[PDB]
């Protein structure tokens, strides 16, 4: 199915753009598969902080786009 190799390396590239651990983890969390909600739906649930929200949304978007194709 989806290129999971590419998936992991693209997410790691994105998490590396963040300075601190928590936004990195928000990235990895956003990148996890969710069959029932879009990335906007999912990130709308998160209120930890602006940088966490941004990383979550960015990595979700990256992950789902890779899955889509």
Author numbering: 677 to 745
Pull verbatim passages from the article behind this deposition.
Upon complement activation, a cascade of proteolytic events generates the complement effectors, including the anaphylatoxins C3a and C5a.
Both murine proteins fold into a four-helix bundle motif as observed for hC5a. The mC5a model was then used to solve the structure of mC5a-desArg. Again, a clear MR solution could be obtained with the four-helix bundle model. The C-terminus of mC5a and mC5a-desArg (region Pro747–Arg755/Gly754) was not visible in the electron density, again suggesting its high flexibility. Furthermore, since C5a is rapidly desarginated in vivo after release from its inert C5 precursor, our findings that hC5a-desArg and mC5a-desArg have differential activation properties towards their cognate receptors indicate that desargination acts as a partial control mechanism mainly in humans but not in mice.
